[PDB]
Amino acid sequence: MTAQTVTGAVAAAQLGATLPHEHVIFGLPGYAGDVTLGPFDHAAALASCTETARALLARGIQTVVDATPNNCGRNPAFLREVSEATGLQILCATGFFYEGGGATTYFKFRASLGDAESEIYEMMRTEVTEGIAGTGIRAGVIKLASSRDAITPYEQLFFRAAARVQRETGVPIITHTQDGQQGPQQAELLTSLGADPARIMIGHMDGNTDPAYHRETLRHGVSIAFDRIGLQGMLGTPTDAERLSVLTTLLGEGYADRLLLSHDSIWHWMGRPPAIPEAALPAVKDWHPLHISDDILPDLRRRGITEEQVGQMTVGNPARLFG
Ligand SMILES: [Co+2]
Ligand SMILES: [Co+2]
Numbered sequence: 001m002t003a004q005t006v007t008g009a010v011a012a013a014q015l016g017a018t019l020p021h022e023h024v025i026f027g028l029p030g031y032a033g034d035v036t037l038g039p040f041d042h043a044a045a046l047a048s049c050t051e052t053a054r055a056l057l058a059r060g061i062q063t064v065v066d067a068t069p070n071n072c073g074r075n076p077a078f079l080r081e082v083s084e085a086t087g088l089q090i091l092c093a094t095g096f097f098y099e100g101g102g103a104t105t106y107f108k109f110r111a112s113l114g115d116a117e118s119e120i121y122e123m124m125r126t127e128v129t130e131g132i133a134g135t136g137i138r139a140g141v142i143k144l145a146s147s148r149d150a151i152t153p154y155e156q157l158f159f160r161a162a163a164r165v166q167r168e169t170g171v172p173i174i175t176h177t178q179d180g181q182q183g184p185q186q187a188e189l190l191t192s193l194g195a196d197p198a199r200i201m202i203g204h205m206d207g208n209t210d211p212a213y214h215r216e217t218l219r220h221g222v223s224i225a226f227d228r229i230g231l232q233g234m235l236g237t238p239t240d241a242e243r244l245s246v247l248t249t250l251l252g253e254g255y256a257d258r259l260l261l262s263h264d265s266i267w268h269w270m271g272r273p274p275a276i277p278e279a280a281l282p283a284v285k286d287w288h289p290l291h292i293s294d295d296i297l298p299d300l301r302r303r304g305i306t307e308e309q310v311g312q313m314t315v316g317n318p319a320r321l322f323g
Pocket of ligand 1: 175176177204
């Protein structure tokens with residue numbers, strides 16, 4: 001095992017309770033073009049993010065997996081600052097985001113002129129085994145993403161590169177699914193390429209409310225994450241009540257060792273600060289990284305989920321997957 005964090009290798013048994021998909025900082029592609037009126041205040045970001053990390057530690061959370069793709073404001077050196085200041089363990093990612101998420105097209109262009117898969121493979125392999133941008137800070141997971149209606153031929157370059165790095169290094173893979181679709185397809189493709197199903201987490205599976213979809217995904221041996229908990233009724237995301245309805249069904253069916261829980265929260269936004277309109281405030285009220293600890297786990301316990309099941313989802317599963 002060992003997990004590769006931004007401060008170094010840590011044993012699987014030292015990961016503790018983990019949030020496996022969050023964003024310490026995050027910018028939607030294009031934020032860097034808005035630098036003049038949306039500059040990065042490093043001191044303010046560090047204060048805000050350290051405060052958040054201290055709050056998680058208070059709740060028994062010892063590790064966070066930052067899922068931020070390379071083109072979405074990823075900043076390993078900043079993650080390391082937050083980690084060294086607080087003791088919160090942080091894994092960072094290597095990967096690029098879905099083909100309708102912007103940026104792109106740099107590799108789209110390179111793919112049209114040459115062997116982009118091989119170049120993406122070398123990037124992922126270098127960032128996992130040696131480090132990111134000269135810093136010596138290594139990625140502890142590979143980030144993949146697909147579009148809603150298909151895993152596009154362009155997206156597949158990244159899936160094929162990631163599978164090879166996975167086979168060679170053991171590194172975990174976590175994913176983005178768009179609008180509650182393609183989970184079975186991701187699982188099929190990655191397993192078909194010989195990637196280790198005990199080291200794959202199919203993401204945003206809470207985006208779909210039909211348990212048959214989750215079950216099919218789960219036939220492939222992989223883990224699945226209800227990782228946007230708290231983001232409610234916003235652009236097709238279900239409510240947390242709908243999420244927990246599906247989760248308790250799956251727990252009742254013995255799936256606790258393959259379910260994981262997160263918020264997909266953003267602790268500090270790159271670019272201009274977010275301007276949330278009045279009618280959207282309910283959607284984001286509970287969308288912050290203390291919601292699972294304070295609201296969700298106690299609610300599951302009230303519903304009859306056992307301490308053993310909660311510990312499996314929040315501690316056991318991450319140790320196996322990331323550790
Ligand atoms: Co995502
Ligand atoms: Co995310």
